[PDB]
Design an enzyme around this catalytic site. Structure first.
Site, PDB file in Angstrom:
ATOM      1  N   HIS A 104      -4.356  -5.643   9.320  1.00 25.85           N
ATOM      2  CA  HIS A 104      -4.725  -4.893   8.122  1.00 25.85           C
ATOM      3  C   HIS A 104      -6.196  -5.229   7.251  1.00 25.85           C
ATOM      4  O   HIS A 104      -6.999  -4.486   7.352  1.00 25.85           O
ATOM      5  CB  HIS A 104      -3.712  -4.773   7.306  1.00 25.85           C
ATOM      6  CG  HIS A 104      -3.740  -3.947   6.184  1.00 25.85           C
ATOM      7  ND1 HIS A 104      -2.407  -3.471   5.237  1.00 25.85           N
ATOM      8  CD2 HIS A 104      -4.554  -3.291   5.532  1.00 25.85           C
ATOM      9  CE1 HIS A 104      -2.872  -2.461   4.328  1.00 25.85           C
ATOM     10  NE2 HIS A 104      -4.225  -2.464   4.298  1.00 25.85           N
ATOM     11  N   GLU A 123      -1.345   1.164  -2.256  1.00 20.86           N
ATOM     12  CA  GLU A 123      -1.013  -0.523  -2.308  1.00 20.86           C
ATOM     13  C   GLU A 123      -0.676  -1.053  -3.860  1.00 20.86           C
ATOM     14  O   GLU A 123      -0.700  -1.973  -4.078  1.00 20.86           O
ATOM     15  CB  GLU A 123      -2.030  -1.074  -1.690  1.00 20.86           C
ATOM     16  CG  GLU A 123      -2.390  -0.784  -0.265  1.00 20.86           C
ATOM     17  CD  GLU A 123      -1.376  -1.261   0.733  1.00 20.86           C
ATOM     18  OE1 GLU A 123      -0.155  -1.684   0.248  1.00 20.86           O
ATOM     19  OE2 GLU A 123      -1.557  -0.927   1.811  1.00 20.86           O
TER      20      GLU A 123
HETATM   21 ZN   LIG Z   1      -5.559  -1.480   3.147  1.00 19.33          ZN
END
Ligand SMILES: [Zn+2]
Ligand code: NI
Ligand code: NI
Ligand code: NI
Ligand code: NI
Ligand SMILES: [Zn+2]
Ligand SMILES: [Zn+2]
Ligand SMILES: [Zn+2]
Lengths: 211, 211, 211, 211
Positions: A160, A79
């Protein structure tokens, strides 16, 4: 020999990683933390796919503002761009935590925003929005999260989890904790009846008191 | 003197048994773990009715592919055949954990499958099915679980719990943890509204990213 | 010098008192434990209004079958007669735990019984009934609990909590734990949909397997 | 040299602050504790915005009955007047705890009172009311809480949390714990069906038994 992210910041990422598990906010999977040094214009971020309790200082990855890795042999968090784009677009955020918490993620999976049923949400804003869905670790998710966090210090990531940002990791952690608490209160209230939501004027007042 | 399951594998079963209780996934009752050594064609499995915190290496039972006990004086887990039939029918599974968790078992008692309301379910597949009910410890349960876990790495056991499998115990444990988390998110979302389920195409993509 | 309840039994009451708090089944308030020595016809019971973590052997109260205190200067648990009447009327119960747990008490406050949505309820019976309401610490509560626990090893106490009994404290504790788990599964399933309840024939089979 | 609040009371505030986090009643944020010395007419209260695990004796603030600070350099809890007005108006309360708990706060955010679905609520009264909403840390909140706690030992603060009072901190803590438990039971029962509420006569009896 002074041009890179300090030992202090690396150790702090490790500390807060552990705190997320110790307080049972998350198990750590898919979660990540970063800090941005504004003078150096470097992001330090947790590595991909290493248990929070096994992360060493040498596993922390340091990147420049365009995502070029300048320290660390580990792959950065998947991320990393979701964090980096925040630092690129916001001057008010120097630390970010992403977590898969419980009730905040419930709301994210419903794609339902979090309103001011509890006044403490003012640590993030009058409400917390839900970003448009995009696959984990993608540019689309990074952009969707940036946009939906505008004017806020937290955002839900559809199906998420949560992303929060603040001036430092202590405050970012506090936002995650408080938004998760507020999400929980809101969800539990919804089971019983209609949660009472504080009006925007009261939340505007709350913002000023919180400063 | 090298023909049986290693000390390493026995100790590891004990370690993960404890981890299941330490992380509060289960209290241990009715839960069991196994590993299969493909070179030796031996299953090592936890014993029946011994508290996870009291299991010694000598309590681990080692069985051949037809269920003949070759090491250990303890009775094997009542679910030994539910584990063994997986190893007999699947080459991709070398470790299995069975647990009576919370929300995964809620779904099992409703006989409701778990869909992709959260993307992390891709550790097990696009969804987790529910096996046909059969009495604990029976051949019928073993067969029902084998069939309903086809093409997946986890399965819900009706009115009972969960079964998960992977390449090793660390990964099997991670699947149990993640499926329990996903079950929880799904159940909690159902209380509030309609959980948004990711489409199969997105889950197919998720499978490829997870490799 | 051998005519009273042993040190062993007193220490064991203390141990299981602590276990109830350590495992977060209860905080201890309004909860109590007892054992009955059949040879001596003496009940040993926890004292009233002492935190489980502060109970000493000398605080344990020992009573004869008619409730005459023969050892201990502390007042016995306010529920002493609820325990004693079980021992007076049932030869199959030598240890009893009363607790204010979570989901079992939810069911008790709804005055709703617990059915076989999970097979593990067979540690107590095919279902767990709810006793008629009566004020804590009264003869009426003791009688109501005796009657509603007939043919079972646990009973819900309306607007109050749970009572369980078994051959010893380890097994009584296991029943409390398992009934609380089953209550939780049942309640959570009810939130989602209609829990599937195993038929009496299957539960009769379960009873025989559990022996 | 004897005119101010004792070391004993300061240490006790710290102890119970910690207990609130240790038992997971709250994380501490927005929470506060106080004691009132009736002979001295002094309130000792926790300081504003310091983590409970970082509070030292020197951070405790001591105030006179009109809110004039007489010991401590820290700013007192933002809720100091909510505590102080209780001591000004009630002779039966010498210690107060304010917390942002879970289910009690759910009820507060619904602005729903807590009735006698469980008999243990009698530690606070036959029910717990919800105060009129007012901004945290204001005179309005202090007055609203005073009024809605009349005749009770606890009150819910709309969209905020809980306030409880008793003769000392141990008892105040017990009230917070018990009211949170009762709130939880009530909320969970509401999910399943209609909680059975004990009648006022039974609660009047409960009050007398609890003395
Ligand atoms: Zn995540
Ligand atoms: Ni340098
Ligand atoms: Ni060998
Ligand atoms: Ni004797
Ligand atoms: Ni003095
Ligand atoms: Zn099982
Ligand atoms: Zn009780
Ligand atoms: Zn507050």
């Amino acid at each position: 020999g002074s041009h890179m992210a300090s030992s202090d910041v690396k150790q702090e990422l490790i500390k807060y990683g552990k705190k997320l598990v110790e307080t049972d906010l998350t198990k750590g999977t898919g979660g990540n933390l970063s800090v941005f040094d504004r003078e150096k214009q470097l992001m330090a971020i947790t590595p991909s796919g290493i248990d929070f309790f096994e992360i060493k200082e040498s596993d922390i990855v340091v990147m420049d503002i365009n995502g070029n890795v300048v320290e660390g042999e580990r792959l950065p968090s998947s991320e990393w761009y979701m964090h980096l784009i925040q630092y690129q677009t916001r001057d008010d955020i120097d630390a970010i935590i992403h977590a898969h918490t419980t009730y905040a993620t419930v709301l994210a999976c419903l794609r339902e925003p979090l309103p001011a049923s509890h006044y403490m949400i003012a640590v993030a804003g009058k409400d917390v929005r839900v970003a448009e869905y995009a696959t984990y670790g993608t540019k689309e998710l990074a952009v969707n999260a940036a946009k939906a966090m505008e004017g806020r210090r937290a955002v839900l990531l559809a199906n998420h989890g949560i992303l929060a940002g603040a001036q430092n990791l202590l405050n970012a952690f506090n936002i995650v904790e408080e938004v998760e608490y507020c999400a929980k209160i809101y969800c539990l209230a919804k089971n019983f009846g209609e949660p009472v939501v504080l009006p925007d004027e009261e939340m505007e007042l709350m913002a000023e008191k919180f400063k």
